[PDB]
UniProtKB/Swiss-Prot annotation, chains A, B, C, D:
Gene (UniProt): bpoA2
Domain AB hydrolase-1, first and last residues per copy: 25-263
An example Gene Ontology molecular-function term: peroxidase activity
InterPro entries registered for this protein in UniProt: AB_hydrolase (IPR050471), AB_hydrolase_1 (IPR000073), AB_hydrolase_fold (IPR029058), Epox_hydrolase-like (IPR000639)
Keywords attached to this entry: Antibiotic biosynthesis, Oxidoreductase, Peroxidase, Plasmid
Biological role: May be a chlorinating enzyme involved in 7-chlorotetracycline biosynthesis.
Organism: Kitasatospora aureofaciens
EC number, UniProt record: 1.11.1.-
Annotated family: Belongs to the AB hydrolase superfamily. Bacterial non-heme haloperoxidase / perhydrolase family.
Quaternary structure, from the entry: Homotrimer.
Keyword Acyltransferase annotated: no
Active site feature: S98, D228, H257
Protein name: Non-haem bromoperoxidase BPO-A2
Catalytic class of the enzyme: oxidoreductase
GO biological process entries: antibiotic biosynthetic process
Length: 441, 441, 441, 441
């Protein structure tokens, strides 16, 4: 798959990308001289943990186009922007490794954090690698970088060999943490990037990210290997955390630069916990959004208070005897049978422990729709469309083009297991039907 | 509630009707000069016994319109037709009392028995009250009826008094079988009917129903009070049973014309047993047809023997513990999940008492059409057509034009109470599905 | 007239209601086994006293539909809710008699007192008729109620006779307080209710209203006959007042259950004093409400003080010489001609005696809508709508959808006697106009 | 080139495919973890032998998309279906290797053999690799497969190395049958497949194909290497042939799993001979179909008998002196000149030895069409379309949209060498013209 980010002479500039899984979107930004595929150990874990995984190849690398233009962090950040806007990513996590950490800082800084829930920096460039008078903690002098450029231009192929040596601490990790075959794959990936991009990339490494850091708005994770030969932890991660004290901070003991493979475990575990925290917050936000829509249907009073409390408790994972919950709902006076069905539906969907409880007649009767075939026809049409949705908003939006009667019947289809849909899409459906009903009052 | 049956000058002609309970529809057609409310003792019993009770007021009576037109049995039968078609009554029982027995005969005769499961005649006019040369068993000469008309026109109010006397055998039954207050209510009801209808009604009483009787297609009950002063049992019920030997026949010893109140018991008991028996008999026949189709899907062996025995036992009306039945089915080895779903479905449909058992997950999963939207789309289309069917063969026939996947999903739709059809149509659906599956093997 | 409250099978459930008089709305809720018409002695008094009288027939009674469903106080209260919402009743008084007192408590309790100014309980069920361990003051054991049900099912017609005996204390009151004809009417009314409702009603009588009582928010009146044989004053009214000490409380010495007829006087006098207090307050509010809107258009200063004082004096009923008032207004400096017209209009409307004063040119010129035909067209359209309004708020609401120019012209139309509306509707019109004008400033 | 088979989140699922050569379509379905390019030794032979070669990359492999969904044989078979339908393949041969043999069985089984002339199974999975109680001949227990999955997830790169070892019997074949460079290419191909697909693939290997096998309708070839370490010939090919006795069956002595490369020769030779047989069978079928169309034109009688016999003899390759044949035809009484032309045309087309015989005047006169330019115009238009056809049916179908006159003229164009078309397309043309003529009679 490709996203077009610009034009070079007669040709467009296209970025290779992939889009896997369902749930909260997590965007992985690779390092030099590798591609989106270098995240494979992390992607698998994220997929299993229940996230939507987005990867892409930076211009000049992997399967992306290989222009001789736009090798700088503003362009790279603009490239990223195009991806985020193209996919309409909301509430996204940005994870950068090495070079990728430059994108994360520069994007956040320039474009802000409207689409962004959290950020993570792994084997970071930050805050400023160039050793100057005003930057004493800098890792190397300018002459040093000039050297790498010269080395890549001389023989990039041979260059990759010595680079992956220190990249992976092969003298320590070969035949242990990393196989010879895994290293072979990395060299092949690098050899496949553009000649021009290879030599141009190292000039972007001493970009000054010092003014980007105060812009970091959202929860952040900083993660570095203490055995990093490529980006000395002392000139990078350690001075970066001083600049961003608020960042959650993890040192990987004796981990090299290429810690994504050698220490995938330690990497995935830190990432997943941080992500789980962020995911929980996202779930809470969704619940509040779902809760507000659900409550909009209920007449104001003490009953509305009880229901809200129950919703909140189930959402917080505390309430859980569905059989007791459903009986309570069933026996509530004043509540409309339809509103009882909607709540019935919501509780069975959100409660963790459904156990072995059969579906409820009172809900079935409330949602089914009087048995009008025209109504049922439209509910089936909606269901067909919802089956293709993966987001709450997309689901909610298409649902709003249907009548309240067709919507309730559609909910019944799902409730009765006659059709099946993801929880977040089911939420969107429910909320559209609540909105329609509330709006009619 | 009203149903419009026609137009008189600037005004429409509306029939007052009521629609109570759930289950098999039973239509009660009142006598002169009373209304649908005169059935109150019978309605209560039928409601308790688990029937859907429909009553209406004949034109010119009770709360119906009071035109000066359409006082004849073809119009009265056409009126009834409009009611049946308006409500889309399927598999209905028609019960007539006195005048009402004229509707039953004439409707059946002219319009046929497509919607009609059984008929009942209480205190019947049949076969022909007019005493002629060709009708020797006739109850009275023409001059006698001419007399009643003249009497009603003279003072209908005073007339009702002497009429209810003989109607109820008040000289015997007052303060005993019937209260003075109950009689007062009857007079009030009569006084409330239209003046024109009161005088016009008695001209319809010597309608010749002799050619209607051979048309009676379906199981019938004939019931008469031996103390009937209004319709002599000897000129009516007794010669009627000769004309329809096949009719089930009940004499109420010393019961008057107004036996609905005075002998409600004896009335309700005969009615309820007949009501019960008809469904079972036809139900038994249907079960025996269905069993062969159902068994055709099961592999030969001892298990097939157990299932057949269970089918036969539920079909023969041994009320089985559905919960125990369903668990047994669920835990059967070798049986395909789909076959288990079909049997699961059949057992819940045929078992006398579901006892408020929640629907079963194993059946729902088996009959979900794989959650395929195309299957579900076709299942909904089939359902639309099945909604218009009233017979096992018609239902089975249209079902055979659909794929096994769409058929199973359709069964799921019904099982989940997302749609509804009559039991016999449901049988046709299950048998088409069984035929399709068996045929694939 | 009917209000639809639900659906039973193929038929809707409609409540018969009436809507008489003008002024503060008073809703009368009848007792068993009677109808809205049983309030006729009270309605006449309320109409003469200047109230808007709303009556309706409970489901299963009088001219309402006769379903075999919804015989319970939550449904009855929901029925009432539908009526109140359908008519958009504001600032309403709820008066219940016997069974009706159950509606009042349950509605107030569940739905709250937003539309409700005051409540009255006459011959109350409250707080809990069932005699139990936890309810010692209960009037009878469960077996006793079971008995009534059995009696009604046996012969409701005969039952009504003995019931009205004790209902009215006929052994005391016949030929004295109540005529034989009045009693005959009551029996006829009862005999006309639904058979099913008659037997189902007595099961609702031992509803526990104990948790409803603390919810009673608004001023209340409790009224009971000390000779009540149907609802013993000692198990009802007397323990009810303990539960609601705040309630105004009236014992009618030797009055039976059916005190609405036998003691209409004592009943109407207590009711009218309490209501009169409430009505006076409402009148004051209306004048005060009008006054605030009227004053909002006048610039702050000593003149605004004089005007306010004059308004208050005419509102308080000091009959003012309109001629003197109008001349004063006319000659006021600083006051806009339009504002003078509005005040001119208000004063002629509120002043007790116009004394045959010709309409004023200065007002006519001020309220002519600039003689613009488009304004006049819209003014006529508004007038058409206002002709159908009976309340201040309804009138004010529709008026706000019109421009200030059309509103002023409409006022002119009324001022010139070219059209006519009720005073309260006229008030709404003037206030909408004042609001529009003030809002423009 | 790509064919889209579905959608994953925001991205479509595209299969990489190639389409080479002309003639009968042969579809090659690769094995794990390789791509369509692994067939290169076979493709070259098929291309030289005169077949149309179609290859594609299974989802997750080679150049196809790499979703994290649809890794199962129903999806894989549905993928294949989309390819066949997209290309409108008629009379196709399906050849599967290893994993690919699962597609062949499942497609044939579910979708049937309408487009399919023959099938071939090389290094087959069939009939069921899982060793169970009911499957004793199974190659391994479930725990064994669970192991492979675990191994791939651990390090797929390293895994490929040991896999190709046994895949190729490198201990035997390296430096002999297979070069180190050829093996290097294979590893590169595998490393290029999707990470998720790599680990998911081995779960599809113990798919039960036992119910698919009886569905195999068309001529089949089973081919296995006796030195197969990956799929033991004893648990696969040998028990598979018992299940399909009818299959032509070839053991490659001491050939490994990767016999496509190591034993390309023995592989190509068996394949080509079978393909030739299949082609001959297809030709026989075509000859019989052609014969029926051709005979439909001839009046019944002894002449029709002679002609049929001659057709059959020429079709069976026995009759061959065209000059003698054509003279016989020419001199036949009763035969229409047009029918003589059609037969003349057919015989010159089917006879192997045309020798050096000039085209015949009697045929030319019969087919030319009277020289009407409109007729000729349409014949040229048809010819343009036929030039793009490669199948008998496609040819016959477009021909049927033309008049008999235009069709005969078109036949003349071809007969006169004014245009040129493939034999099978020429057959379709002839048969359309015969059908049209016969249909006119």
């Amino acid at each position: 798959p490709f996203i077009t980010v610009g034009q070079e002479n007669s040709t467009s500039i296209d970025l290779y990308y992939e889009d896997h899984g369902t749930g909260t979107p997590v965007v992985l930004i690779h390092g030099f001289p590798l591609s989106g595929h270098s995240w494979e150990r992390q992607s698998a874990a994220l997929l299993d943990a229940g996230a939507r995984v987005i990867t892409y190849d930076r211009r000049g690398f992997g399967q992306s186009s290989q222009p001789t233009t736009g090798y700088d962090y503003d362009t790279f950040a603009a490239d990223l922007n195009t991806v985020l806007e193209t996919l309409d990513l909301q509430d996204a996590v940005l994870v950068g490794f090495s070079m990728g950490t430059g994108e994360v800082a520069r994007y956040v800084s320039s474009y802000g954090t409207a689409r962004i829930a959290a950020v993570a920096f792994l084997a970071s460039l930050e805050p400023f690698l160039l050793k100057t008078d005003d930057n004493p903690d800098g890792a190397a002098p300018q002459e040093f970088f000039d050297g790498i450029v010269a080395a890549v231009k001389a023989d990039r192929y041979a260059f990759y060999t010595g680079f992956f040596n220190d990249f992976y601490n092969l003298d320590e990790n070969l035949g242990t943490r990393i196989s010879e075959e895994a290293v072979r794959n990395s060299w092949n990936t690098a050899a496949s990037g553009g000649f021009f991009a290879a030599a141009a990339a190292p000039t972007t490494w001493y970009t000054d990210f010092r003014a980007d850091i105060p812009r970091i708005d959202v929860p952040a994770l900083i993660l570095h290997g203490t055995g990093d030969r490529t980006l000395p932890i002392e000139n990078t991660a350690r001075v970066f955390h001083k600049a961003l004290p608020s960042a959650e901070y993890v040192e990987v003991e004796g981990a090299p630069h290429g810690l994504l493979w050698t220490h995938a475990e330690e990497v995935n575990t830190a990432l997943l916990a941080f992500l789980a925290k962020a995911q929980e917050a996202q779930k809470q936000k969704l619940l509040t959004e779902v809760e507000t829509y659900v409550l909009s249907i209920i007449p104001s009073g003490p009953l509305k208070a009880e229901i809200a409390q129950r919703l909140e408790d189930v959402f917080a994972g505390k309430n859980t005897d569905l059989e007791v919950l459903m009986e309570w709902l069933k026996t509530r006076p004043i509540l409309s049978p339809l509103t009882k069905g909607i709540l019935g539906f919501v509780f069975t969907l959100t409660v963790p422990s459904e156990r072995g409880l059969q579906r409820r007649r009172f809900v079935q009767n409330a949602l089914n729709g009087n048995g009008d075939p025209n109504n049922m026809d439209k509910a089936v049409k909606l269901y067909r469309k919802l089956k293709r949705e993966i987001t709450f908003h997309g689901a909610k939006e298409i649902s709003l083009s249907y009548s309240a009667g067709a919507l309730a019947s559609c909910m019944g289809l799902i409730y009765n297991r006659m059709g099946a849909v993801t929880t977040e899409v089911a939420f969107g459906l429910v909320c559209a039907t609540c909105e329609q009903i509330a709006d009619s009052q």
